[PDB]
Design a protein around this ligand. Structure first.
Ligand SMILES: C[C@]1(c2nc3cccc(C(N)=O)c3[nH]2)CCCN1
Ligand SMILES: [Zn+2]
Length: 209
């Protein structure tokens, strides 16, 4: 199954992932209630997720989407936060765990901003926070998030709630675009687990300002 390769802090690949993560911290409307109060992370390690079977499923789907999208799979690197990160790195993303109540329905959701994904690391609205101290703004406990290859293909642009079970006809993803009366930041949604690969596993802490 899955093998985790350690990236060295001196390598360009580690430094690239960390800078995407650190540079995309945004101020959130909840004033940090969900993800905590911070302006920076302390990155503990960065591992590359290797899984032959998961990679094969992802690459086959990229070929199918490409055939339906003028020979482009339209891949983006995006963040994902979830309390089920262990299941994802071993079994892959799974749309069967997605439920229809989400803003864009039963999809798998990603963000270009790491601080958005940091809000979901411990669950719904940050849940009860870290397992040891029950603190959503814990500065001690190691959190984990993924920085994923996401196959978007033909994206359907959406501004308001649209509870879908699958991608809209003739499309492969939904992009929830920001709007004055809606989202502050874009969110990217897929409806098939094989349209995302959990490429990097980031272990980190949020830092006290
Ligand atoms: C609220 C919801 C969610 N919306 C997101 C928007 C951007 C990123 C993420 C993430 N997990 O990194 C999101 N997760 C709907 C599905 C379960 N959690
Ligand atoms: Zn803690």
């Amino acid at each position: 199954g899955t093998i985790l390769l350690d990236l060295a802090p001196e390598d360009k690949e580690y430094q690239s992932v960390e800078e995407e993560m650190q540079s995309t911290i945004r101020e959130h409307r909840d004033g940090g209630n969900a993800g905590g109060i911070f302006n920076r992370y302390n990155v503990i390690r960065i591992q590359k997720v290797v899984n032959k079977k998961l990679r094969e499923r992802f690459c086959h789907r990229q070929k199918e989407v490409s055939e339906e999208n003028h020979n482009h799979h339209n891949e983006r690197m995006l963040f994902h936060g979830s309390p089920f990160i262990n299941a994802i790195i071993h079994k892959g993303f799974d749309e069967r765990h997605a439920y229809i109540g989400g803003m864009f329905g039963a999809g798998i959701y990603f963000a270009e901003n790491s601080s958005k994904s940091n809000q979901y690391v411990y669950g719904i609205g940050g849940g009860t926070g870290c397992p040891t101290h029950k603190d959503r703004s814990c500065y001690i406990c190691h959190r984990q998030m993924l920085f994923c290859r996401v196959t978007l293909g033909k994206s359907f642009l959406q501004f308001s709630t649209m509870k879908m079970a699958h991608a809209p006809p003739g499309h492969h993803s939904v992009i929830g675009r920001p709007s004055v009366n809606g989202l502050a930041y874009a969110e990217y949604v897929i409806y098939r687990g094989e349209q995302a690969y959990p490429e990097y596993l980031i272990t980190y802490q949020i830092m006290k300002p």
